[PDB]
Amino acid sequence: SMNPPPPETSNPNKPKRQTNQLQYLLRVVLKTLWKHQFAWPFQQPVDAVKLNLPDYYKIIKTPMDMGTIKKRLENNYYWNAQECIQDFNTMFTNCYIYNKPGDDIVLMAEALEKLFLQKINELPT
Amino acid sequence: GKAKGKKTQM
């Protein structure tokens, strides 16, 4: 495929280690966002070939999506919660730098981001 | 780059 390979989602030799914050990120934050009615454009990598977006991956240096984040959480890929939070932030940034302000997708991202940030403001210690 | 398609129902 002419799309980039998807981001890595498992680390073969990394120990399995939970934290309160990582449990929250999976079981509260990702759970809530995945089921939101506006989640679907964000549930998988952007398929720029299928969407005929030849400049998407020129504009977006660090692709990220909730499908990747979900797998990373399930596979205990993240060493800490901040890494996961950064991936969410990157996902939203990508949407806002590529898509025109006021496009449907942007309003959808804004609703998801608001919900995300409301949950992060209640992150455990 | 090119706009994405229609995504919500108004």
Residue numbers in the entry:
A (entry chain A): 42 to 166
B (entry chain C): 1198 to 1207
Original authors' sentences:
Bromo and extra-terminal (BET) proteins provide a recruitment platform initiated by the recognition of acetylated lysines (Kac) by their tandem bromodomains (BRD, Dhalluin et al., 1999, Jacobson et al., 2000, Owen et al., 2000). BETs, like all of the 42 human BRD-containing proteins, contain additional interaction domains that recruit other proteins to the acetylated protein target, forming complex assemblies and contributing to processes such as chromatin remodeling and transcription. Direct targeting of BET-BRDs by small-molecule inhibitors such as the high-affinity and pan-BET specificity thienodiazepine (+)-JQ1 (hereafter referred to as JQ1) enables their displacement from Kac. Multiple decreased interactors harbor sequences that can directly associate with BET-BRDs in canonical or new BRD-mediated structural binding modes, and we propose that the tandem BRDs present in each BET protein may be capable of simultaneously recruiting both a histone and a second interactor.
Based on our earlier work defining the flexible G at the X1 position as a binding preference for histone H4 (Filippakopoulos et al., 2012), we fixed this residue to screen a subset (91) of all 2521 unique K-GX-K motifs found in the human proteome, focusing on nuclear proteins with Kac sites annotated in the PhosphoSitePlus database. Additional peptides carrying a Kac-GX-Kac motif, including those from GATA1, ATRX, POLR2A, and TOP2A, adopted the same histone H4-like structural association with BRD4/BD1. Our structural analysis identified multiple cases of non-histone proteins binding to BRD4 BRDs through histone-like motifs in the same structural template we initially described for H4. Our data therefore suggest that Kac-XX-Kac motifs beyond those found in histones can be recognized by BET BRDs.
